[PDB]
Amino acid sequence: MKQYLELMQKVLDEGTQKNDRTGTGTLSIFGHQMRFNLQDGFPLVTTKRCHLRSIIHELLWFLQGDTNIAYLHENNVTIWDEWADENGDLGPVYGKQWRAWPTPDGRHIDQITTVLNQLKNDPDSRRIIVSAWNVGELDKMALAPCHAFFQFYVADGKLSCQLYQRTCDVFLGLPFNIASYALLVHMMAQQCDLEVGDFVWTGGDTHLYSNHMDQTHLQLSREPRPLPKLIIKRKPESIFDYRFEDFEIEGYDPHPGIKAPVAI
Amino acid sequence: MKQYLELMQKVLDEGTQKNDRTGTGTLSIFGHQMRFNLQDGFPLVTTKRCHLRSIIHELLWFLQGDTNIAYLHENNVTIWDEWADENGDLGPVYGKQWRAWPTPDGRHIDQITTVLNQLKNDPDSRRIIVSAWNVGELDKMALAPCHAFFQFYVADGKLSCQLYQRTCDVFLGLPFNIASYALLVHMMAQQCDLEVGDFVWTGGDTHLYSNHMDQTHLQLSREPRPLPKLIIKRKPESIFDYRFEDFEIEGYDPHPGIKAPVAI
């Protein structure tokens, strides 16, 4: 997409050379923001073939709040295998914080229900927020939250959402990340009888790995195509009742997929 | 400053009309980002007279972690009086989370020391973060964090910082907000023997109150002047040992101050 390709080019033109968790070098910039008007189409990259299968399953999994990968495994979703232990546990990652943030007084805060409550009764609230950045539980998580915090906003009958992504592998992870949150906005909007607004993506350490340079140049040589349209076949009673089959994508005509090799 | 005035104009041109905590109407946009290269000068607005007295005291107060306004009062800083109770308490606001985030297992996490530890031993970390958004303690705070989360970044010997501001009164609060964080970056950089980089400001619900429109148009008619220079007269042994007198501003030549009337 235009916004995505412009970010790739920006990292290439302005990125500084360094390293990551000590391994593969990277070109990186700090601080970036882009906006996707969801009324213009579902933001699924077209300059390379992407699939929504894992994205959808992971999101439904997040919303359920169970951090064991059992559900993902039953559906052959393996993106979390790398971080899961023998029992399939990941510690209190995303879902646990979204649905049951533990407080010092023994309570479990349901941030998703809280946000829906706010969108329904106080849509102009300036604190319709979900945070996965639970400082007191970071050490127990298999992975510190990458999509760390997000906020909702309502205006002119439309729901918008801004995500703060602390770290981002532009080539491998970003396409997945944008589609995931765009899907969440559509689901939240449907439950609130609102139209979709903008998805605002804000990033911290935004980078391209050195071994993805040829792949990036290849993608940049391709012309973006019209964005597809997301179709929600059913209207569930609540945000926790969506099913994999409820989602469909129309008019998706991407360029060939590009593999993303990673070092270990 | 150029960046500040451009935001004012953007809210005027693109802002949507609505309301706040039910009271004064506002013009607002959602999602914005601007960057201040601290090497170009200290970002203290010049199109209206600003003072750093309260800003400095509040920051030193944050760093100490005590949320009682006693210190502020002793120095005639009254910006928190509005929210403090009879005893001068505010609940677990900013400072408490910065220095002693309570965990469910009975610990108090010092995020400031953690960040300094990271800048010293792992400057390329993609999670050098401080969060004040403690979901489990929001109800006990006199005010939910407005400057909610910030992240540091190091490149080419320079320290950068990005702040996520969930809500922002562009006319009254923003000038204060930018200077406060710019000061923190300078202090953090000095302690780490680094040069200052960029301060990246990211906002959520960014607005202008209806009763600040004339004031905004007046400020927009004024030409920004060269930014001043921050002078740190001393080099403390740690981030917790700064004193009010350690800071001085040179070359500050602003336009006259503009009062900001607020409804109650």
Side-chain angles (χ1 to χ4, degrees), chain A residues 10 16-21 24 26 28-33 35 101-105 107 109 111 122-127 129-131 133-139 143-144 148-156 160-167 198 200 202-207 209, chain B residues 10 16-21 24 26 28-33 35 101-105 107 109 111 122-127 129-131 133-139 143-144 148-156 160-167 198 200 202-207 209:
Chain A
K10 178 181 170 56
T16 184
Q17 188 65 55
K18 58 160 58 182
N19 317 298
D20 62 307
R21 226 153 151 183
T24 307
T26 66
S28 69
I29 61 175
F30 183 63
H32 185 75
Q33 189 177 84
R35 182 181 306 262
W101 172 298
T103 68
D105 64 350
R107 290 147 56 232
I109 307 305
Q111 299 186 75
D122 190 23
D124 289 320
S125 171
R126 299 160 171 173
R127 50 182 283 191
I129 294 164
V130 174
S131 177
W133 201 263
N134 189 331
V135 183
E137 294 216 298
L138 294 172
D139 287 14
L143 210 190
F149 175 113
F150 52 107
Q151 175 179 15
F152 291 95
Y153 173 96
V154 180
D156 303 303
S160 291
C161 175
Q162 181 170 196
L163 162 71
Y164 186 90
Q165 184 74 21
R166 71 164 177 93
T167 184
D198 301 322
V200 183
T202 291
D205 190 315
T206 307
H207 48 274
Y209 280 103
Chain B
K10 178 181 170 56
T16 184
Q17 188 65 55
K18 58 160 58 182
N19 317 298
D20 62 307
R21 226 153 151 183
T24 307
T26 66
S28 69
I29 61 175
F30 183 63
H32 185 75
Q33 189 177 84
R35 182 181 306 262
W101 172 298
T103 68
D105 64 350
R107 290 147 56 232
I109 307 305
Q111 299 186 75
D122 190 23
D124 289 320
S125 171
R126 299 160 171 173
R127 50 182 283 191
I129 294 164
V130 174
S131 177
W133 201 263
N134 189 331
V135 183
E137 294 216 298
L138 294 172
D139 287 14
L143 210 190
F149 175 113
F150 52 107
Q151 175 179 15
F152 291 95
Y153 173 96
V154 180
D156 303 303
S160 291
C161 175
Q162 181 170 196
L163 162 71
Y164 186 90
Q165 184 74 21
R166 71 164 177 93
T167 184
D198 301 322
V200 183
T202 291
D205 190 315
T206 307
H207 48 274
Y209 280 103

Side-chain angles (χ1 to χ4, degrees), chain A residues 14-55:
Chain A
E14 303 165 48
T16 184
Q17 188 65 55
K18 58 160 58 182
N19 317 298
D20 62 307
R21 226 153 151 183
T22 292
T24 307
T26 66
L27 273 186
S28 69
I29 61 175
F30 183 63
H32 185 75
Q33 189 177 84
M34 51 194 183
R35 182 181 306 262
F36 299 94
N37 184 335
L38 301 179
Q39 295 279 162
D40 295 326
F42 192 77
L44 184 62
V45 168
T46 65
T47 49
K48 88 174 184 185
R49 166 160 257 109
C50 286
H51 299 286
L52 291 185
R53 188 171 187 286
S54 288
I55 293 171

